[PDB]
Amino acid sequence: SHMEDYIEAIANVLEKTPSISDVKDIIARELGQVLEFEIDLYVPPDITVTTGERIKKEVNQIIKEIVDRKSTVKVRLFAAQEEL
């Protein structure tokens, strides 16, 4: 349940993080005392590899700051969906 509190705050931040177009999905589970996060994000289709690595680092910083306990963070980046 404190798990849902963390997810909500994480989503609130990510929504306001300009390098991220949208949150695709946030999953969390407990592995003993470790919280495991899987974060899927939409980003601009033209990002470079370096920018993508820099966004994963920002996401990781956000989680580490919000969650007091030990965590693992896996981030996946997807091209934002463009209008047809």
Author numbering: 187 to 270
What does the paper say about this structure?
CDFs are utilized by MTB to transport iron cations from the bacterial cytoplasm into the magnetosome lumen during nanoparticle biomineralization. Like most CDFs, the magnetosome membrane-associated (Mam) proteins MamB and MamM share a common two-domain architecture consisting of a trans-membrane domain (TMD) and a cytosolic C-terminal domain (CTD). Here we studied magnetite cluster MamB and MamM CTD structures from a phylogenetically distant magnetotactic Deltaproteobacteria species, BW-1 (MamBBW-1 and MamMBW-1). Each MamBBW-1 and MamMBW-1 monomer consists of two alpha-helices and three beta-strands and is folded like-metallochaperone, similar to previous CDF-CTD crystal structures.
To obtain structural and biochemical information, recombinant His-tagged MamBBW-1 and MamMBW-1 CTDs (residues 190–270 and 213–293 respectively) were over- produced in E. coli cells. SAXS results showed that MamBBW-1 scattering curves are similar at concentrations of 1 and 5 mg mL-1, indicating that the molecular dimensions are independent of protein concentration over this concentration range. In contrast to MamMBW-1, MamBBW-1 crystal structure exists as a monomer and does not create the classical V-shape dimer in the crystal, yet superimposition of MamBBW-1 monomers over MamMBW-1 V-shape dimer implies that MamBBW-1 may in high probability form a V-shaped dimer under the right conditions. MamBBW-1 dimerization interface, similarly to all CDF-CTD structures, showed the typical parallel S-shaped backbone structure. Support for such dimerization can be found at the possible interaction between Val235-Pro231 and Ile233-Thr234 from each monomer. Additional support is given by the MamMBW-1 and MamBBW-1 electrostatic potential maps, showing that the top of MamBBW-1 monomer and the top of MamMBW-1 V-shaped dimer have hydrophobic and positive patches, while the lower parts have hydrophobic and negative electrostatic charges. As an alternative, MamBBW-1 different oligomeric state can also be explained by crystal contact and crystallization conditions that break the dimer and create alternative contacts with similar or lower energy. Putative BW-1 C.B is composed of Glu271 (MamMBW-1) or Glu224 (MamBBW-1) from each monomer. Trp269, Val307 (MamMBW-1) and Glu222, Lys260 (MamBBW-1) are also located at the hypothetical metal-binding site but are not predicted to be involved with metal chelation. Overall, based on our analysis, it can be assumed that the composition of amino acids within MamBBW-1 and MamMBW-1 putative metal-binding sites are suitable to coordinate and bind metal ions.
